[PDB]
Amino acid sequence: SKDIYTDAGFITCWYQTSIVVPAEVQNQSVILCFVSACNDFSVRLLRDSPFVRQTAFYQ
């Protein structure tokens, strides 16, 4: 969760050079992004997820 004490930083992406394309080819393209953890990764303290929100039972 969010706190000021353990803040981690910023991921940013910039144009080094532009996208040069030839004629009769579309200009606007799409980047996809992926994320995973490395082999030195860990988690420590169990809690309930803040995503589960029910009101009544599931009859």
């Binding site: 579309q26 393209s29 799409v30 996809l32």
Partner: peptide
């Protein structure tokens, strides 16, 4: 298809 299909006016 995540990236949608796209091409020019003569392909």
């Amino acid at each position: 298809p995540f990236a949608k299909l796209d091409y020019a006016a003569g392909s």
